Each structure stands twice: as C-alpha cells, then as structure tokens.
Amino acid sequence: LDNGLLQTPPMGWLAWERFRCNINCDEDPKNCISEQLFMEMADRMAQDGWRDMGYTYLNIDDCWIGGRDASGRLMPDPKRFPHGIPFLADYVHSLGLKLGIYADMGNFTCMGYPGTTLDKVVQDAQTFAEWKVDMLKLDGCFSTPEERAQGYPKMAAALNATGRPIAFSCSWPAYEGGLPPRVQYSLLADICNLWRNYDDIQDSWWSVLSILNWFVEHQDILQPVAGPGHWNDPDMLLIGNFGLSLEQSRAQMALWTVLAAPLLMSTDLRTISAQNMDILQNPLMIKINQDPLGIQGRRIHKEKSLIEVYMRPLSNKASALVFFSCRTDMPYRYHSSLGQLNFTGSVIYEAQDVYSGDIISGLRDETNFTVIINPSGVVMWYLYPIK
Amino acid sequence: LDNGLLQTPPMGWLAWERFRCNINCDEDPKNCISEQLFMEMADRMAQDGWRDMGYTYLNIDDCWIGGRDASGRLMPDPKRFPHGIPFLADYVHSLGLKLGIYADMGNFTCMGYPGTTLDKVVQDAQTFAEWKVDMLKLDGCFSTPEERAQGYPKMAAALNATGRPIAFSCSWPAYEGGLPPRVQYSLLADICNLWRNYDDIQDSWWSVLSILNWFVEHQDILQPVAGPGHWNDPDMLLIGNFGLSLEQSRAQMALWTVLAAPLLMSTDLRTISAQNMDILQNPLMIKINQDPLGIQGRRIHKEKSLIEVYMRPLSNKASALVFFSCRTDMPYRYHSSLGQLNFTGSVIYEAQDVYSGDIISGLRDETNFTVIINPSGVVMWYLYPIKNLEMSQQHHHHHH
Numbered sequence: 001l002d003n004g005l006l007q008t009p010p011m012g013w014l015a016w017e018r019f020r021c022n023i024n025c026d027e028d029p030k031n032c033i034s035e036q037l038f039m040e041m042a043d044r045m046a047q048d049g050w051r052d053m054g055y056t057y058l059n060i061d062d063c064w065i066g067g068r069d070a071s072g073r074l075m076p077d078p079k080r081f082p083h084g085i086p087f088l089a090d091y092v093h094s095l096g097l098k099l100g101i102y103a104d105m106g107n108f109t110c111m112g113y114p115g116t117t118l119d120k121v122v123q124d125a126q127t128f129a130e131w132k133v134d135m136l137k138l139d140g141c142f143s144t145p146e147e148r149a150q151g152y153p154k155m156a157a158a159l160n161a162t163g164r165p166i167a168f169s170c171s172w173p174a175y176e177g178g179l180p181p182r183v184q185y186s187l188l189a190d191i192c193n194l195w196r197n198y199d200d201i202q203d204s205w206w207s208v209l210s211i212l213n214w215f216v217e218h219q220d221i222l223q224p225v226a227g228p229g230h231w232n233d234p235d236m237l238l239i240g241n242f243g244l245s246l247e248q249s250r251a252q253m254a255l256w257t258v259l260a261a262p263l264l265m266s267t268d269l270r271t272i273s274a275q276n277m278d279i280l281q282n283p284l285m286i287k288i289n290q291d292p293l294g295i296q297g298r299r300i301h302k303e304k305s306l307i308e309v310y311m312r313p314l315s316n317k318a319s320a321l322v323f324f325s326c327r328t329d330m331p332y333r334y335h336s337s338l339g340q341l342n343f344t345g346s347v348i349y350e351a352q353d354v355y356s357g358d359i360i361s362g363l364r365d366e367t368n369f370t371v372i373i374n375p376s377g378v379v380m381w382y383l384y385p386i387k
Numbered sequence: 388l389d390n391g392l393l394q395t396p397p398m399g400w401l402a403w404e405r406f407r408c409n410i411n412c413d414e415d416p417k418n419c420i421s422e423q424l425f426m427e428m429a430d431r432m433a434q435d436g437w438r439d440m441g442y443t444y445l446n447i448d449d450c451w452i453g454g455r456d457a458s459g460r461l462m463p464d465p466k467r468f469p470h471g472i473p474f475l476a477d478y479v480h481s482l483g484l485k486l487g488i489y490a491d492m493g494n495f496t497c498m499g500y501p502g503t504t505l506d507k508v509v510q511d512a513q514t515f516a517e518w519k520v521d522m523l524k525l526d527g528c529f530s531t532p533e534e535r536a537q538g539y540p541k542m543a544a545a546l547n548a549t550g551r552p553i554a555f556s557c558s559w560p561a562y563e564g565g566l567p568p569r570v571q572y573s574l575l576a577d578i579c580n581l582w583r584n585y586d587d588i589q590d591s592w593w594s595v596l597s598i599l600n601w602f603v604e605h606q607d608i609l610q611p612v613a614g615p616g617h618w619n620d621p622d623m624l625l626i627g628n629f630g631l632s633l634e635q636s637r638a639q640m641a642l643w644t645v646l647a648a649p650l651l652m653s654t655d656l657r658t659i660s661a662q663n664m665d666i667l668q669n670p671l672m673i674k675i676n677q678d679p680l681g682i683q684g685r686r687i688h689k690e691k692s693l694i695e696v697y698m699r700p701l702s703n704k705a706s707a708l709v710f711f712s713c714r715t716d717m718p719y720r721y722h723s724s725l726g727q728l729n730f731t732g733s734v735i736y737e738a739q740d741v742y743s744g745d746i747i748s749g750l751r752d753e754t755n756f757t758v759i760i761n762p763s764g765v766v767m768w769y770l771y772p773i774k775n776l777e778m779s780q781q782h783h784h785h786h787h
C-alpha cells in the first residue's frame with residue numbers, strides 16, 4: 001500500500017496471542033483486555049529497551065468494543081477503557097510509540113463484538129483517524145467473500161481519505177484460503193501494508209511448523225509479492241510464552257526474520273525472562289529483519305538429514321543464512337560449503353553467527369564448514385563479501 | 388516378573404534418546420557412546436543427588452558392541468570400551484549404582500550391531516551375568532513374530548538360570564502393535580519386569596502427546612496390567628534436552644509419575660540446568676512415582692475446555708491428581724471439586740501442590756476449588772485425608 005508506511009516490516013506488540021478475549025477484570029484485573037493492560041505494556045516498551053530496538057507498535061486486538069452510540073459511532077467498553085481510546089493513543093504517543101486497533105469487516109468481530117459492516121467502513125475509518133490511531137488490523141469474520149471484496153478496498157480508500165497515515169493489516173486472504181485463484185496478491189499489495197495469509201498461530205511448536213510448512217510449500221507465489229510497504233504476515237511471535245523451548249524460540253525469531261515477517265510480539269512484557277528478551281532484542285537479527293531492500297527469503301535446500309537451509313538477500317551484497325534442524329534426536333554436525341548453497345563466483349566471505357556473535361572469516365565457495373544445529377533449532381549467519 | 392526386582396518403577400539414566408548411535412569419538416569424544424561417557428554420568432549420578440533421590444540404573448543402549456570373539460562371546464568395541472564391561476560394572480557398582488545393558492532379539496540390533504539370535508540367547512545371558520550386569524533391555528529388530536514369541540521367554544528363562552537377578556525390559560509388545568490379541572499381557576507380566584508398549588519417544592512435545600494419547604486410548608487394557616515387578620514403559624523422559632518447554636517438561640514428569648512409568652532419564656547430566664534438575668529431583672514427585680502399591684493411574688476427566696484430569700491411587704488412602712491443559716492459548720482457571728472427580732462422601736482432605744509445595748486445607752467433596760494451569764502444562768496435587776496426618780502420628784510400637 002503506497003502510503004509511505006512500513007517500508008520495513010512492522011515491529012511491536014499485539015494483545016491477542018497471549019491475552020486473547022479475557023474480559024474478566026473483576027477476577028483477573030492484571031491480565032484482562034483493558035486500558036491498564038495497554039498502559040502497562042506501553043510503559044515496558046518505553047522503559048525496557050523495546051522501543052529503542054525498533055518495537056514501536058502497541059496493538060489492540062478483539063474484545064475492546066463496547067457498542068455504538070446514537071450516531072453509530074464506535075465506543076470502547078466503558079468499564080475496561082474508562083478514559084477512552086484518544087487517551088490511550090495520546091498516552092502511547094507521549095512515549096514515542098504507535099497505537100494499533102482492530103475491527104472486523106463483517107457483522108461482528110470473531111468474538112461477537114460490533115462489526116464494521118460495509119455501511120460503517122467510512123465512519124469507523126474516520127473515528128480511528130480522529131482518535132489518532134496509527135494502525136488497523138481488519139479481521140474477516142461474519143462476512144461473505146463479496147463483502148470482503150468490496151470492504152477491504154473500501155477501507156483502504158476510507159483510511160486514505162482521512163489524511164492520517166494508518167498502517168493497514170488485512171486478514172482478507174486468510175478467510176479465502178490464502179492462495180490463487182481466490183486470492184489476488186497484486187491487488188492485496190496495492191490496498192494493504194501487510195496481510196494475514198494463513199491460520200492463527202497458537203502457543204505450540206506444531207503451530208509454528210504448520211505455518212512454516214505452508215509458507216515454504218507456497219514460497220514461489222508468496223516470496224515475490226513481499227516488499228517495502230506490503231508484507232506477508234505469518235502471525236505473531238510466541239517468544240516469551242509457554243509452548244516453545246529455547247531452541248524453538250530462537251528458531252521462530254530467525255525464520256520470521258528470514259521471511260521478512262512482522263516482528264509482532266504477544267507476550268507478558270512485565271515478566272519476560274532475560275533469555276527471551278535477549279532473543280527479541282538481538283540487534284543483528286533486527287537489522288536483518290529490517291533490511292531496507294525488503295526481499296523475503298526462501299528455503300533453498302532440504303536434506304535427507306532433515307536439515308533445511310533458508311537464505312535471505314540483504315543490502316550491500318550481504319545475505320542471511322538459517323540452518324534449521326527438523327531432527328528430533330540430538331545436535332547435528334551439518335557439513336556444507338557456500339558453493340553447495342549456490343553462492344557462485346570468486347568472492348571471499350565473512351560470516352557472523354547471529355546468536356553467538358562469533359565470526360567465521362575467509363570463506364570461499366569451496367571452503368568446507370561445519371555448523372552444529374540443535375534439534376528444533378537453528379544456526380543463523382549474517383554473511384558478506386570481504387577484501 | 389517374579390525375580391524380586393523393580394517392586395517400584397525403575398529410575399535411572401539411559402543413553403539412547405540424547406546420545407543415540409554416536410560412535411565418532413575421534414571428532415566427538417565428549418558425546419560418543421564410550422566407557423568415558425558412562426563413567427562421567429555415573430560420577431554425576433553419585434555426586435549430584437541423583438543416586439540419593441533413587442536414580443540407580445545407568446543403562447547402555449545400542450551401538451556398544453565390537454563383535455563376537457572366536458567362541459561367540461560378545462565383546463564391546465575395544466576402542467570405545469578399552470577396559471571392558473566388567474570394569475565398567477565394577478566402577479558403577481563402587482558408586483552404589485546398577486549397570487544396564489542392551490541386546491536385540493533378532494539377527495542384528497536396530498543399528499546393525501551383532502544380534503542375539505535364538506542360538507545366542509543363553510550364551511549372551513551368561514555373559515551379562517558374568518559381567519555383573521543388573522538390567523537388560525531386549526530390543527526386537529530383525530526378527531519375525533515367531534522368533535520373538537520363542538525368544539523373549541527363552542531369554543527370561545536364560546537370565547533366571549544364571550542365578551543373578553537381572554531386571555528384564557522387553558520390547559516385544561512394541562513390535563506387535565501393543566494390544567491384544569497379538570500381545571498377551573498376562574505372559575509379559577510373568578516374563579518381564581517392564582515392557583515398551585509403543586513408539587520410540589523423540590525430543591518433541593508432539594511425541595509426548597502421541598504416547599500419552601495412545602496410553603489413554605487403551606488405558607482400560609493397560610492400566611490393570613501394571614504393578615510391582617511388572618510395568619508399562621511409555622519410554623524415556625525428555626527433561627533436560629531441547630524439545631520441551633518448561634511447562635512441557637513439568638508435564639511429562641507429572642504424567643509419567645501418575646502412569647507409574649519408569650523414570651529413565653536420557654540427557655546430559657554434566658550440563659543439565661538447575662531448573663531441569665529441580666523437576667527430576669522433586670522428592671514428593673519421586674515418592675508418588677515410587678508408591679509401594681504400584682497402581683497405575685488413569686485419565687478420569689476430559690472437558691471441552693481441553694483440561695484433562697488424571698488420578699493415581701496411592702498408599703494410605705492418598706491420591707495424586709494431575710490437572711493437564713491441552714490448551715494452546717493462555718493460563719486457564721479450572722474450577723472443580725473433589726465430588727465432581729468421583730471422590731466419595733464425608734472424607735475431609737488436604738492437598739500439597741507437588742511443584743509449588745503449597746498446602747490446600749479443608750477440601751470436602753462439595754468444596755469448590757480453582758487451579759491455574761498453563762498451556763501444555765500441569766498442576767499436580769498430592770491429596771490425602773486430613774485424618775491420616777493424625778493417625779500416622781498415633782502408631783504404637785513394641786520391641787521383640
């Protein structure tokens with residue numbers, strides 16, 4: 001979407017994966033979807049390095065809406081958002097952050113809150129701009145394919161007409177199977193800054209693998225369509241939560257990075273471990289995710305040993321390599337060379353291991369190397385030519 | 388198997404899951420299958436609390452064998468076990484530990500090492516006894532159903548005839564689909580101390596779930612067959628390795644415990660984290676696993692919320708409850724009561740949370756309680772009548 005926004009993938013925090021539709025503030029005031037939750041997460045983003053490392057969006061998901069007023073104007077739940085959305089936008093902006101919100105192109109949101117029907121698209125866009133929202137995720141429950149086909153472009157046009165830059169995250173393709181012929185990716189790129197292609201992530205490794213598999217199976221279609229201002233979105237990061245081991249957490253971060261994915265966390269920043277913080281705040285990892293060329297990577301090799309290799313092209317003739325072990329036994333000593341991974345010519349390279357920081361220098365195409373990859377884990381290199 | 392052994396489930400360490408068939412000692416001397424590996428793990432078991440908490444077996448798995456000598460007697464790989472197996476058993480015994488070994492009922496071991504064919508069953512049994520081995524896992528690759536039907540009983544007979552008590556772990560049912568009519572658990576209980584019923588565990592939560600699912604699906608058949616001296620074996624613990632998160636690690640320990648499973652670790656004890664050690668050395672958990680009644684637990688409740696409840700009966704009218712969340716979203720507040728979990732009227736209970744150590748007092752059948760369970764995680768209770776604390780302190784004794 002040619003609105004000047006998200007020339008690199010968005011980074012931030014989104015409520016949904018970890019906090020879901022918890023509206024029981026009487027019994028669970030610390031974890032319910034409320035003004036307080038968003039304010040506390042904003043404070044953590046401002047104080048604990050997140051904003052400074054690039055995590056700038058703080059996004060509200062489903063279950064925020066209270067009703068519509070006598071003029072049809074959307075309102076938040078008055079008990080859980082007592083000061084209203086402008087207050088929250090203004091608070092988040094005071095901290096150098098951006099505020100995302102959520103609506104559904106349909107009769108109801110997925111959890112049954114008031115929907116943004118076709119006759120409300122313009123009014124709701126105007127309301128969000130007036131509130132000084134910076135991003136909108138538009139979900140697709142409770143609509144027909146024909147409604148979505150009218151509604152997603154209508155919303156893009158309506159947001160534009162407000163005059164406020166609002167990053168536009170579109171769930172449209174996920175409701176239509178994610179693939180041609182039903183999904184037109186050239187159209188999506190013109191109307192959306194990013195789109196959810198596929199199934200909701202859940203807090204499990206099986207879920208990450210399911211998503212990674214679908215993205216790799218369809219990479220010939222998906223890889224070319226991503227670039228500055230228009231991203232594929234394989235859904236939120238699980239790092240900090242319950243289902244992923246340490247190796248798996250590191251793998252998700254590396255693979256999302258090689259895929260030029262959004263880095264949208266969804267975890268309790270108030271209690272996040274040092275180890276998980278260190279994964280998410282890895283400066284080189286973030287540099288790679290945010291590479292200005294915005295070229296999505298692809299799986300380039302899959303071996304009978306169950307080691308997979310991903311490669312992402314980067315600026316200044318650099319590359320990212322992810323060596324990923326699908327094995328479920330023990331560490332594996334993977335032997336390769338840059339020549340076997342389709343680096344050609346007479347270039348000499350240097351690599352930095354993204355997680356260890358160690359430097360491997362003087363790699364020619366014919367130079368044999370070994371990387372030790374743990375099960376359900378990765379080794380990631382930032383590779384560049386040297387003199 | 389009525390050989391006096393494993394009146395409670397075996398606890399120890401087995402090389403296979405974590406170290407597999409790594410024989411490259413030239414390139415990987417710290418992690419290859421070798422005497423050094425076993426000696427180092429033995430030291431860790433003796434020094435780091437493992438033995439003292441009940442973990443007594445140190446078990447060799449596949450890929451130890453060098454060949455058979457001119458008389459047909461098994462030899463370990465001379466490059467990787469230079470001092471021989473008797474030396475290793477002596478060493479292990481000197482530390483108050485027991486040595487387990489591995490063979491295959493068939494032409495070759497699964498990894499292609501010399502097999503214990505029907506003609507070698509007796510010689511191999513005698514060799515193991517002579518080496519002062521304490522446990523044998525007998526795998527089932529490269530055999531036919533008839534060879535296994537003859538061989539597993541033949542080995543049990545051969546072990547018995549040596550006069551040395553050797554705990555006998557039988558893979559027979561895993562190679563027969565784990566269920567009647569092909570598997571005869573009455574015979575297995577008479578010839579084996581434990582048996583692998585099902586698929587090899589791998590270092591993944593999916594794997595743990597697949598095994599749990601199978602054991603629960605078939606629990607009406609499997610639960611009654613377990614008891615002192617004859618256990619179901621859902622395979623090794625993954626705690627300490629790569630694939631399980633903290634919640635999943637705590638879950639596997641709890642669920643293996645309620646299933647009266649062996650607690651056979653397979654992890655690098657030299658680098659294991661304090662967090663993982665704390666799971667595996669939890670004293671109340673181990674007490675429950677080792678309960679003298681040896682009654683395997685069951686899944687008693689499954690809810691549309693994807694919360695499952697398992698219960699294991701224990702000594703002194705106590706029970707273990709494991710509340711298990713199959714959810715993949717966020718912590719869940721599970722509301723229940725003992726009456727809804729089929730506890731029978733009038734008894735007042737107390738519970739100790741096995742992981743937090745917290746005590747919950749005044750539980751009657753009707754009293755509503757809430758437990759907070761994390762995704763792919765558990766809450767486990769040790770539950771006892773609050774008349775058994777008093778009665779355990781009013782036992783009168785006399786000399787004789």
Ligand SMILES: *[C@@H]1O[C@H](CO)[C@@H](O[C@@H]2O[C@H](CO)[C@@H](O[C@@H]3O[C@H](CO[C@H]4O[C@H](CO)[C@@H](O)[C@H](O)[C@@H]4O)[C@@H](O)[C@H](O[C@H]4O[C@H](CO)[C@@H](O)[C@H](O)[C@@H]4O)[C@@H]3O)[C@H](O)[C@H]2NC(C)=O)[C@H](O)[C@H]1NC(C)=O
Pocket residue numbers: 002003004007159160161162163164165166
């Ligand atoms: C509502 O919708 C309109 C229409 O889509 C948006 O207006 C567009 O805004 C974008 C982003 O600001 C504009 O794109 C930028 O144009 C710059 C100048 O281009 C001139 O020359 C071209 C022909 O060569 C003309 O078409 C155009 O009218 C201009 O006169 C470029 O310099 C910018 O370059 C960017 O990309 C390159 C690499 O791709 C980078 O190197 C640069 O750093 C930079 O990021 C960019 O292309 C676009 O021109 C606007 N179109 C129109 C018709 O005005 C509104 O932004 C939008 N409003 C809201 C509130 O959402």
Ligand SMILES: *[C@@H]1O[C@H](CO)[C@@H](O[C@@H]2O[C@H](CO)[C@@H](O[C@@H]3O[C@H](CO[C@H]4O[C@H](CO)[C@@H](O)[C@H](O)[C@@H]4O)[C@@H](O)[C@H](O[C@H]4O[C@H](CO)[C@@H](O)[C@H](O)[C@@H]4O)[C@@H]3O)[C@H](O)[C@H]2NC(C)=O)[C@H](O)[C@H]1NC(C)=O
Pocket residue numbers: 389390391546547548549550551552553
């Ligand atoms: C080869 O196979 C034979 C079986 O065919 C095995 O023999 C069995 O060995 C076990 C273990 O040693 C014996 O079990 C023990 O019997 C002890 C004595 O009981 C006898 O006497 C009573 C009289 O009241 C009879 O009723 C009974 O049938 C026995 O004949 C018990 O004292 C032992 O109790 C143990 O457990 C209790 C808890 O349950 C503890 O409190 C005790 O401390 C103690 O540890 C035990 O039951 C069994 O009797 C033998 N069976 C037969 C048929 O002889 C061999 O062991 C086996 N050899 C090898 C090398 O594997």
Ligand SMILES: *[C@@H]1O[C@H](CO)[C@@H](O[C@@H]2O[C@H](CO)[C@@H](O)[C@H](O)[C@H]2NC(C)=O)[C@H](O)[C@H]1NC(C)=O
Pocket residue numbers: 107142143144
């Ligand atoms: C969304 O809402 C519209 C308007 O309420 C729904 O259309 C009505 O549906 C009811 C219940 O089936 C019918 O009895 C009415 O006759 C309909 N009225 C009108 C004016 O259309 C529609 O079914 C809903 N759409 C989706 C996708 O769920």
Ligand SMILES: *[C@@H]1O[C@H](CO)[C@@H](O[C@@H]2O[C@H](CO)[C@@H](O)[C@H](O)[C@H]2NC(C)=O)[C@H](O)[C@H]1NC(C)=O
Pocket residue numbers: 494529530531
């Ligand atoms: C184990 O080894 C024996 C001995 O080689 C195998 O027996 C042969 O099997 C083939 C085909 O199955 C027959 O054609 C021969 O008649 C057998 N040879 C002898 C000398 O008996 C046996 O099949 C092997 N068993 C397994 C399960 O692999």
Ligand SMILES: *[C@@H]1O[C@H](CO)[C@@H](O)[C@H](O)[C@H]1NC(C)=O
Pocket residue numbers: 366367368
């Ligand atoms: C790399 O290793 C292979 C063995 O797989 C060897 O044959 C080859 O000569 C080596 N290449 C170089 C450039 O050293």
Ligand SMILES: *[C@@H]1O[C@H](CO)[C@@H](O)[C@H](O)[C@H]1NC(C)=O
Pocket residue numbers: 753754755
């Ligand atoms: C337990 O909770 C139920 C509803 O969930 C309630 O009806 C009942 O009265 C409660 N029982 C007790 C003993 O408080």
Ligand SMILES: OC[C@H]1NC[C@H](O)[C@@H](O)[C@H]1O
Pocket residue numbers: 016061062109110111139171196200
């Ligand atoms: O109900 C909210 C839920 N709907 C489905 C979306 O894909 C999720 O990310 C989340 O927004």
Ligand SMILES: OC[C@H]1NC[C@H](O)[C@@H](O)[C@H]1O
Pocket residue numbers: 403448449496497498526558583587
């Ligand atoms: O090859 C060894 C391997 N064979 C199959 C067994 O089930 C595993 O536990 C292991 O012993």
